[PDB]
């Protein structure tokens, strides 16, 4: 997962 | 400007999560991850941030008649907010964002931990089967009127899905003694  | 709207800062976009007040004050609450990148964004400056860990983040109004109690639909409405809750699995759920504007779909799990890499850990996320992408990070997270989360990451995309985590609005909220509008 990553932010966005 | 509404929950979901591109709030931007230099070459960066994120999403407005929700308006709020501080003791009569307009700010509108963020991704952390989002807030950690400037003190100017192009609705006024920011107030506070806290990621990794937490992802939130506040920005003070520049123009406090901006500051709009509602989120927006990307169809031409909007959906009003009146309070902030807590998500429950098995919630229907919809979250608007710059991005892909605005999709649907329900709470799957809660307080997850998420492992952004070199970006760090984030604690306590509320887990989604709505699917998000860059740029939707900060959007709101609701339910008709009631306020549940902030966008801050996830896999996938929207045209193939995946798995999206929120920040819990509730815990920004009482980290900057604000109240949704």
Known sequence: PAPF | ?181
């Open chain 2, 1 to 181: 400007i509404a929950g979901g709207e591109a709030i931007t800062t230099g070459g960066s976009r994120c999403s407005l999560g929700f308006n709020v007040s501080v003791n009569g004050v307009a700010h509108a609450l963020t991704a952390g991850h989002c807030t950690n990148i400037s003190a100017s964004w192009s609705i006024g400056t920011r107030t506070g941030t806290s990621f990794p860990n937490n992802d939130y983040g506040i920005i003070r109004h520049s123009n406090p008649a901006a500051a709009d109690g509602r989120v927006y639909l990307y169809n031409g409405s909007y959906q009003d907010i009146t309070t902030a809750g807590n998500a429950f699995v098995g919630q229907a759920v919809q979250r608007s964002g710059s991005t892909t504007g605005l999709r649907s779909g329900s709470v799957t799990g809660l307080n997850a931990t998420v492992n952004y890499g070199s970006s760090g850990i984030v604690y306590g996320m509320i887990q989604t089967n709505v699917c998000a992408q860059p740029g939707d990070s900060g959007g709101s997270l609701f339910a008709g009127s009631t306020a549940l989360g902030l966008t801050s990451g996830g896999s996938g995309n929207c045209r193939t899905g995946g798995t999206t985590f929120y920040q819990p609005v509730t815990e920004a909220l009482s980290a900057y003694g604000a109240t949704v509008l």
